[PDB]
Design an enzyme around this catalytic site. Structure first.
Site, PDB file in Angstrom:
ATOM      1  CE  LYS B  18      -3.617  -0.621   0.028  1.00 22.25           C
ATOM      2  NZ  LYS B  18      -4.664  -0.759  -0.974  1.00 22.25           N
ATOM      3  CD  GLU B  39       8.517   3.340  -7.875  1.00 19.02           C
ATOM      4  OE1 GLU B  39       8.482   2.439  -7.138  1.00 19.02           O
ATOM      5  OE2 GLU B  39       7.855   4.003  -8.427  1.00 19.02           O
ATOM      6  CG  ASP B 113      11.530   0.850  -4.030  1.00 17.51           C
ATOM      7  OD1 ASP B 113      11.200  -0.145  -4.996  1.00 17.51           O
ATOM      8  OD2 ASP B 113      10.604   1.544  -3.664  1.00 17.51           O
ATOM      9  NE  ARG B 114      10.503  -2.928  -8.295  1.00 18.63           N
ATOM     10  CZ  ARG B 114       9.962  -4.080  -8.078  1.00 18.63           C
ATOM     11  NH1 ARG B 114      10.579  -5.175  -8.042  1.00 18.63           N
ATOM     12  NH2 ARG B 114       8.601  -4.145  -8.027  1.00 18.63           N
ATOM     13  NE  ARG B 171       0.880  -0.237  -4.078  1.00 19.16           N
ATOM     14  CZ  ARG B 171       1.958  -0.614  -4.387  1.00 19.16           C
ATOM     15  NH1 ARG B 171       2.717  -0.040  -5.511  1.00 19.16           N
ATOM     16  NH2 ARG B 171       2.615  -1.954  -4.099  1.00 19.16           N
ATOM     17  NE  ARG B 173       5.720   2.096  -9.075  1.00 17.86           N
ATOM     18  CZ  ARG B 173       5.201   1.110  -8.168  1.00 17.86           C
ATOM     19  NH1 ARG B 173       4.138   0.679  -8.219  1.00 17.86           N
ATOM     20  NH2 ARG B 173       5.976   1.346  -7.077  1.00 17.86           N
ATOM     21  CD  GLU B 176       1.150  -0.313 -13.397  1.00 16.74           C
ATOM     22  OE1 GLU B 176       1.549   0.421 -12.543  1.00 16.74           O
ATOM     23  OE2 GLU B 176       1.090  -1.662 -13.071  1.00 16.74           O
TER      24      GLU B 176
HETATM   25  C1  FSK Z   1      11.660  -2.469 -11.887  1.00 15.85           C
HETATM   26  C2  FSK Z   1      10.814  -2.301 -13.121  1.00 15.85           C
HETATM   27  C3  FSK Z   1       9.375  -1.946 -13.214  1.00 15.85           C
HETATM   28  C4  FSK Z   1       8.824  -1.883 -11.779  1.00 15.85           C
HETATM   29  C5  FSK Z   1       8.362  -0.591 -11.318  1.00 15.85           C
HETATM   30  C6  FSK Z   1       7.894  -0.278  -9.889  1.00 15.85           C
HETATM   31  O1  FSK Z   1       8.434  -1.269  -9.116  1.00 15.85           O
HETATM   32  C7  FSK Z   1       8.059   0.455 -12.277  1.00 15.85           C
HETATM   33  F1  FSK Z   1       6.882   0.815 -12.652  1.00 15.85           F
HETATM   34  N1  FSK Z   1       8.730  -2.117 -14.108  1.00 15.85           N
HETATM   35  C8  FSK Z   1       7.011  -2.046 -14.210  1.00 15.85           C
HETATM   36  C9  FSK Z   1       9.087  -2.541 -15.484  1.00 15.85           C
HETATM   37  O2  FSK Z   1       8.424  -2.678 -16.432  1.00 15.85           O
HETATM   38  N2  FSK Z   1      10.684  -2.863 -15.612  1.00 15.85           N
HETATM   39  C10 FSK Z   1      11.290  -2.717 -14.372  1.00 15.85           C
HETATM   40  O3  FSK Z   1      12.620  -3.029 -14.663  1.00 15.85           O
END
Ligand code: FSK
Ligand code: FSK
Lengths: 315, 310
Positions: B18, B39, B113-114, B171, B173, B176
């Site tokens: 969330k 991020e 974050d990742r 949520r 992005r 997206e």
């Molecule tokens: C890390 C990554 C993401 C993830 C995101 C958010 O975690 C970005 F929206 N996404 C959605 C991709 O399409 N490619 C990536 O390499």
């Protein structure tokens, strides 16, 4: 532990790199020296279809205005990934076998090119040609693998007139005769040599950054930063409104410095006969840095890898 | 004699938590002994390229609609994935020299974050499954995964698909699109990832088990290795080309030394936060390499946050 000499023959294409290399390998026996050749089969078939053709056709269509800069850039970026793949996997599998820096080596491993060719040099030239973004170049830079000890790299020197002539006579499949690209790639490799010398003379790009506006290593005085690769990256895309590089890009340059500064760079004069080049290169390997291998079984493993590579991806 | 560091990479398929989930993570970063590398949305939307996420989802959509070819889509996805991963890769590369060997509470806890594999392996592999990336490109990205340093703790999520769809829908992005096929693909890849680490850690040899794909640890068919029985990667006699086999050797080496932890997202944001802290007791700490490493690290993370985070 037995010793290894690794030598990456690099620099702009069209100078006589391949002939010279093969002639040197022809002097050894079999257990003495191995060659990791140009992976043309990867480029033409295994990784994608006719990658060199795609690169040159894309630049052409850009120049003619048949496609946009963005369109060219997505193709060039993807193409460069395919170009770089064999160098990158070769480095990653080799890495655990390489020991500390170290009398004749048990094995000499000669490469047709280093990863920086496809991650740094050709992309920087395409950027100069307007078909790659500087952000993408820097992304490639951040992905340059850590520089293994005993990384000896041989770059070429050749008058531009003789280079243009030699190049016209050895076009690769799919290649077109782009002299602007030849100028770009010659310039990039010149900057590369200066960059290595700059770093090894104690140059700090962050200290000299403000000196920017508007070749040989292993010898000579410290170059001006404007004569090094750092100069390519004062581009408006990379600059914050306050005028400095965004930190993300500055960090990529920190990586560029770290990777290049530990390399042992040499310049071969290609302005001579094939046999002349060979003997020049041979003499040059006397001042080159050897390493130990990690296990005694590293040597034959390495020979197997090189031969496997050559069989599968060599012409 | 050097101070200790705990690195924690929060990863797994996006859209499981969330928005009040990250705030607590920013809140946790409020302490002086914890920093939260957020991020890099500003890089994706502005600095590296313009609206990279939009570019990605529009491209899949157009492919799905037949408006562009598989080849057109592949070159776009490939170059976009370079942009996506750049902040992770630069960060890893500048951090690498500061990390010592494995090692009480740590002097500093760094929560990312990742991890680089999200952009180099996971999203690329999912796009391969969506027909918008070649498997050769994915293995080229794999070949560029930076060496796995000590103390690489990766947190992956657990959430039932329906609940995940719900949270993700709430949520989205910028740029997206809510694509159920992509959700399934990315969830599958991350599931295989977790299985792949266990497979490797239990001594699984992909070269030894390879034949089983055509005929106590997971079956190789339930690991990431199964994705690369792709016909693009095979010789006329069915053998994997060596260049792709070496890339799989790299995949194995990078993944085996990762320390995976599973975070149950099927609870309250505070519950998720608490669970994350519970997980840290089993995570692997390292020494740093210089006495100046710690403040250098804090500076990097804060600068990253300020410049590229929201
Ligand atoms: C890390 C990554 C993401 C993830 C995101 C958010 O975690 C970005 F929206 N996404 C959605 C991709 O399409 N490619 C990536 O390499
Ligand atoms: C390595 C490399 C080359 C060089 C080649 C041979 O030197 C292939 F033609 N060329 C021509 C590119 O366009 N990109 C590259 O990455």
């Amino acid at each position: 532990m037995p010793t290894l000499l690794r030598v990456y023959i690099d620099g702009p294409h069209g100078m006589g790199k391949t002939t010279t290399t093969q002639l040197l390998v022809a002097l050894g026996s079999r257990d003495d020296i191995v060659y990791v050749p140009e992976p043309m089969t990867y480029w033409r078939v295994l990784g994608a279809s006719e990658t060199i053709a795609n690169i040159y056709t894309t630049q052409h269509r850009l120049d003619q205005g048949e496609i946009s800069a963005g369109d060219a850039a997505v193709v060039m970026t993807s193409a460069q990934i395919t170009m770089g793949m064999p160098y990158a996997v070769t480095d990653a599998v080799l890495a655990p076998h390489i020991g500390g820096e170290a009398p004749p080596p048990a094995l000499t491993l000669i490469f047709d090119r280093h990863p920086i060719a496809a991650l740094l040099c050709y992309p920087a030239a395409r950027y100069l040609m307007g078909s790659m973004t500087p952000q993408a170049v820097l992304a490639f830079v951040a992905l340059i693998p850590p520089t293994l000890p005993g990384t000896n790299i041989v770059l070429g020197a050749l008058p531009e007139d003789r280079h243009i002539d030699r190049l016209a006579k050895r076009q690769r499949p799919g290649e077109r005769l782009d002299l602007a690209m030849l100028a770009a790639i010659r310039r990039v490799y010149g900057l590369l040599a200066n960059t290595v010398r700059y770093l090894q003379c104690g140059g700090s790009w962050r200290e000299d950054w403000g000196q920017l506006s508007g070749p040989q290593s292993n010898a000579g005085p410290r170059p001006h930063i404007g004569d090094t690769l750092f100069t390519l990256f004062r581009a408006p895309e990379l600059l914050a409104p306050n005028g400095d590089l965004y930190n993300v890009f500055a960090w990529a340059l920190d990586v560029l410095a770290k990777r290049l500064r530990s390399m042992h760079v040499f310049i071969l004069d290609y302005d001579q006969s094939p046999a002349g080049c060979r003997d020049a290169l041979l003499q040059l390997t006397s001042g080159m840095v050897q390493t130990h291998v990690t296990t005694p079984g590293s040597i034959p493993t390495i020979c197997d890898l090189a031969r496997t590579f050559a069989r599968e991806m060599g012409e």
